[PDB]
Amino acid sequence: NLYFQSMDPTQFEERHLKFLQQLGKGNFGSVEMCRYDPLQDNTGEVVAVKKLQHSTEEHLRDFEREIEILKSLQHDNIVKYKGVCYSAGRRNLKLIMEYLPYGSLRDYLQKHKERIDHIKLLQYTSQICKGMEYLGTKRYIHRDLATRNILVENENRVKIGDFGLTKVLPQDKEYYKVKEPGESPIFWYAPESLTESKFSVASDVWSFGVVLYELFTYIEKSKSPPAEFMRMIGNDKQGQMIVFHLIELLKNNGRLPRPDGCPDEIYMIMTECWNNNVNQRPSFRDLALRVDQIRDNMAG
Ligand SMILES: C[C@H](Nc1cc(-c2cnn(C)c2)cc(Nc2cnccn2)n1)c1ccc(F)cc1
C-alpha cells in the first residue's frame, strides 16, 4: 500500500509516441508500429506497441501479468521488451517492444517463399527451441506456440513474439491447470491439455511439434493444422463435436501427415514431440541439440 511498484511512466510518454502503421489484430489485442521521437525532430527509434482490443478489468489485469513476463525475459530469440506507455493521461497501459520488420513467421512463410529453403527452416526451428529452453528456466509455459506467434527479424533470425497465454508454473507443480479458459488454440493442444486443461513444458513441446509441421508445410493452402485435422475428422462437423473427435483421434494415434518434401528425420522429430506419454516427449534442450547436429552434419 505505502509505496507502489516501480513503473517508469516517463520512458515512453504518449505525446512522443507517433503512429506509423496498424500491424494486426491478434486475439483481444492490437499491435501498432510507432516511432518514439522525444526530441520532436522526426527521428527516434521505431517500436512496436501492443494494446488491448477490449479494455475490461480482467483483460487489463492479465495484460499487466503478460507485460511482467515479457520484461523478465532477455534472450536473442524472444522479442525485446522496451517499456510501457501509460497513455490516456496514465489511465491506460500499452506495451512497448522493439519492432521486427518481417512480421509473423506464419505470414512470412506464405509471402516470402522466394527466400526460404530447408536450411532456413531448420535455423528457425533451432532458434524457436532455444527461446523455449529459456522460457523453461523461468518456469513459464507459453501455451500458444504457433507460427502466428513467432516474429521474423530478418532472413536469419526469428523470435517468439507474443506471450498472451503464457502462465507461470506454481512453485510446487510441473503443470498449470487453467481454470477459466478463454478461446483455445485446440489444433496445437496436447491431449492432456484438451482433456484436463493441464499445461506444462511438455505440452509446449507437443505444440512445438505442430510448429515444425507448419514450417515444412510452407503454410500451403489446405495444409494448415486446422484444415488437415478437419479433413481427418470430417469437414462438416461443428461445435463441440469437433473437439470430441479431435480428442478421440489424438488419443488413438491420429496425427498430422508428413508434409510433402519433409525429410523422414524431421517428421520423426514431429512424431516424438507428439507423444501421448507426457514424460517421453523430448526436452527443448534435446531438440535444439538434435536440430543443430542435423544442420552441422550437412556438407560444408
Ligand atoms: C500482430 C503483429 N503483427 C505484425 C506484423 C508485422 C509485419 C507485417 N508485414 N511486415 C513487412 C511486417 C510486423 C510485426 N512486428 C512486431 C510485432 N510485435 C512486436 C515486434 N514486432 N507484427 C504480431 C505478429 C506475430 C507476433 F508473434 C506478434 C505480433
Distance 40 CA to ligand 1 centre (A): 25
270 and 219 part of one domain? yes
Which of 16, 41, 38 shows the shortest CA–CA distance to 94?
16
Distance 240 CA to ligand 1 centre (A): 32
Would you say residue 148 lies in a domain? yes
CB of 153 sitting under 6 A from ligand 1 = no
Would you say residue 91 lies in a domain? yes
d(CA 100, CA 155): 11
Residues whose CB falls within 8 Å of the CB of residue 98, separated by 6 or more in sequence, listed in order: 47, 48, 79, 80, 82
Distance 164 CA to ligand 1 centre (A): 14
Reported resolution in A? Answer: 1.4
Here the CATH number for the domain that contains residue 79 is: 3.30.200.20
d(CA 270, CA 258): 9
Would you say residue 32 lies in a domain? yes
Q: Three-state DSSP class for 182?
A: coil
**What does the block give as the cell for 79?**
522479442
Residues whose CB falls within 8 Å of the CB of residue 17, separated by 6 or more in sequence, listed in order: 34, 35, 36, 47, 49, 85, 87, 96
Q: Are 231 and 216 in contact (CB under 8 A)?
A: no
| Amino acid code (one letter) for 216 | F
53 and 197 part of one domain? no
From 25, 27, 31, give the residue whose CB has the most ligand 1 atoms within 8 Å, as the site to mutate: 31
Positive/negative CA dihedral, 143, 283, 108, 69? positive
Structural domain total, the chain: 2
Residues whose CB falls within 8 Å of the CB of residue 120, separated by 6 or more in sequence, listed in order: 155, 156
244 and 122 part of one domain? yes
CB of 104 sitting under 6 A from ligand 1 = yes
CB of 17 sitting under 6 A from ligand 1 = no
Would you say residue 2 lies in a domain? no
d(CA 270, CA 211): 9
Here the CATH number for the domain that contains residue 241 is: 1.10.510.10
- What is the SS3 string spanning 250-292? HHCCCCCCCCCCCCHHHHHHHHHHCCCCHHHCCCHHHHHHHHH
d(CA 13, CA 42): 15
Q: Three-state DSSP class for 75?
A: coil
DSSP summary character for residue 107:
H
Q: Which residues of 155-176 are buried (b: 16+ CB within 10 A; e: fewer)?
A: eeebbbbbbbbbbebeeeeebb
List residues forming the annotated binding site for ATP. Answer: 23-31, 50
d(CA 1, CA 158): 41
Distances (CA, A) of 205 to 160, 210, 274: 14, 9, 8
Distance 279 CA to ligand 1 centre (A): 34
- How many DSSP H helices and E strands does the chain contain? 10, 11
288 and 178 part of one domain? yes
144 and 269 part of one domain? yes
158 and 242 part of one domain? yes
Q: Are 97 and 144 in contact (CB under 8 A)?
A: no
Domain of residue 38 covers 14-98
Pairing of strands 81-85, 45-52: unpaired
Last residue of a domain, one of 40, 74, 98: 98
Supply the DSSP string of 24-58, one letter for each residue.
EE-SSEEEEEEEE-TTSSS-SEEEEEEEESS--HH
**Residues forming a β-bridge with 152:** 158
Residue matched to cell numbers 523430448: 282
d(CA 32, CA 20): 7
What was the experiment behind these coordinates?
X-ray
120 and 94 part of one domain? no
Q: Catalytic amino acids?
A: 144
Which of 105, 80, 114, 85 shows the shortest CA–CA distance to 14?
85
Q: Three-state DSSP class for 249?
A: helix
CB of 147 sitting under 6 A from ligand 1 = no
**What does the block give as the cell for 146?**
504457433
DSSP summary character for residue 187:
G
**What does the block give as the cell for 298?**
550437412
Cα R_g (the chain), whole angstroms: 20
Q: Which protein residue has the closest C-alpha to ligand 1 atom 20? A: 99
Supply the DSSP string of 215-237, one letter for each residue.
HHHTT-TT-SHHHHHHHHH-TT-
Last residue of a domain, one of 38, 72, 98: 98
Residues whose CB falls within 8 Å of the CB of residue 21, separated by 6 or more in sequence, listed in order: 32, 33
d(CA 192, CA 203): 8
Would you say residue 255 lies in a domain? yes
Would you say residue 291 lies in a domain? yes
List residues forming the annotated binding site. Answer: 23-31, 50
d(CA 251, CA 26): 30
Q: What are residue 236's phi and psi, to 5 degrees? A: -85, -5
Last residue of a domain, one of 98, 126, 143: 98
